[PDB]
Ligand binder design. Structure first.
Ligand SMILES: *C(=O)[C@H]([C@@H](C)O)[C@H]1CC(SCCNC=N)=C(C(=O)O)N1
Ligand SMILES: *C(=O)[C@H]([C@@H](C)O)[C@H]1CC(SCCNC=N)=C(C(=O)O)N1
Ligand SMILES: [Cl-]
Ligand SMILES: [Zn+2]
Ligand SMILES: [Zn+2]
Lengths: 237, 237
């Protein structure tokens, strides 16, 4: 691990504070603007959709990425949530009601055992099974996110290879002639997350970032700040 | 099937001739500028990488999308070919030596049976096992390409679901907040191919196009012409 304090300019020039963590897979080396905050644990918020979807698929709660989850008919504030979804669109739109339904069907016992087998964060599901990742006791740091993501990339998590490929499919966010990004956003009204990886021809760069997000105004800064670091480091054009 | 002769403006305004075929999955309806050429069979050229990779994976010739195929040490004219590749980069760079090696390991007997089970084109492997898709007798039309692609999308081809997901992963070409394109290019010095599909939130549009390509000058017109039709039809922004 290597601290590059010069990356802080990417946060400060947007009047922002936070951390970006990168991991070069081929070289087994990591880089961050702030080593301390890189190991500070936070609520995972919607980034928990990754472990949640893996367990749901492995347990048969979800059949595949095109199976339809019917909207329960309760209208919620996020307009995109009030409709039928599959795994692809549930991830893209961070559709909490779908993931709460996943968690209820999984149950507390299977959830806790599976998170332990994943070595995910602090492994604490207290106390609502359908809302612990939002307002309970589970916490994960940026470096622990990368640790979890590396296992998923290599199909080394303690679930079926098929479950892992399907979740990696659903993580697809961006792709062009130079790179592929699979990732997941999160927001809990206090902090904002962006965790994933960048696939290249001959390497992969894992990333985890979070930042203070007092208001929804600048949620877009999560992706923008990350891409500016990737550009600076010549990872993407 | 419905012929929209107005799409020909997309070819003629580039001094080009060819066909674009689209298929609306949700509505089960197809559209093309030229119904005749839509059913005209051509050499598949590098688009054969899709069936070839499926059979190789199902037979164990390829383990997964990150397994390394060592370059044989013969330098060929395409600079990108003279190096180690995996399934991802073999598809992106259309690396013929890798696919010829696949075909040799598969063999004529298994190749012919598998193409028949796929109902792929005319199902004629004459006569070089490692070069028939380039200069042999196999031929496929644009509508037959879509027929093959629909089965792959639904995991309905006569191979493992795992093999089909891995090939669909390797077909990834482009992705943003509005759509995902999985596809494969082809070029045989006479005609140029672009076959695949566009994934949306709630639908999929399959496509197959080919055009006369006398010189390498305008290979980029394959993607450009296709995207202009998609834009005209309000499939992508
Ligand atoms: C997850 O972190 C949250 C949810 C649990 O509060 C969802 C909600 C949002 S913002 C809603 C509007 N979307 C704007 N893009 C996100 C998010 O990551 O943006 N995740
Ligand atoms: C497949 O159709 C051919 C090969 C069998 O001749 C390959 C070669 C090319 S062009 C080589 C340089 N690349 C430019 N982009 C393609 C192609 O589809 O572009 N496929
Ligand atoms: Cl994918
Ligand atoms: Zn076990
Ligand atoms: Zn059979």
């Amino acid at each position: 691990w290597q601290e590059n304090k010069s990356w802080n300019a990417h946060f400060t020039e947007h009047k922002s504070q936070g951390v970006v963590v990168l991991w070069n897979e081929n070289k087994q080396q990591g880089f961050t603007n702030n080593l301390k905050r890189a190991n500070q644990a936070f609520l995972p918020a919607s980034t928990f959709a990754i472990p949640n979807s893996l367990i749901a698929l492995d347990l048969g709660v979800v059949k595949d990425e095109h199976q339809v989850f019917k909207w329960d008919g309760q209208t919620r504030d996020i307009a995109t949530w009030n409709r039928d979804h599959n795994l692809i669109t549930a991830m893209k739109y961070s559709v909490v009601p779908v993931y709460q339904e996943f968690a209820r069907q999984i149950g507390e016992a299977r959830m806790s055992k599976m998170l332990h087998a994943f070595d995910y964060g602090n492994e604490d599901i207290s106390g609502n099974v359908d809302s612990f990742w939002l307002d309970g006791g589970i916490r994960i740091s940026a470096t622990e996110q990368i640790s979890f993501l590396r296992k998923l990339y290599h199909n080394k998590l303690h679930v079926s290879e098929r479950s892992q490929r399907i979740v990696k499919q659903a993580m697809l966010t961006e792709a062009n002639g130079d790179y592929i990004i699979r990732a997941k956003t999160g927001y809990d009204t206090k902090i904002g997350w962006w965790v994933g990886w960048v696939e290249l021809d001959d390497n992969v760069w894992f990333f985890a970032m979070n930042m203070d997000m007092p208001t929804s105004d600048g949620l877009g800064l999560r992706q923008a700040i990350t891409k500016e670091v990737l550009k600076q480091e010549k990872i993407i054009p």
